[PDB]
Amino acid sequence: MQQQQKEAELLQKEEANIRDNQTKIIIAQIQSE
Amino acid sequence: MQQQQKEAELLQKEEANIRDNQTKIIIAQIQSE
């Protein structure tokens, strides 16, 4: 369960980075209009 | 209880990142007007 919560942290951090990444390209698209 | 408070930290951090990102795209929309 240490391992489970640790990999939960890992997947949280990678998906947080991903979400920030789509929103970065989204603001780029918004300003490209 | 340690596990519960630690995953509480995790969910607070992910939702805080989501909120900041949402307001980033919101200000992008505001300035796109």
Curated annotation (Swiss-Prot), chains A, B:
Locations listed in the record: Virion
Biological role: Forms the portal vertex of the capsid. Probably involved in head assembly, genome packaging, tail attachment, and genome ejection.
Subunit structure: Homododecamer. Interacts with the Cargo protein 1. Interacts with the major capsid protein.
Record's protein name: Portal protein
Organism whose genome encodes this protein: Bacteroides phage crAss001
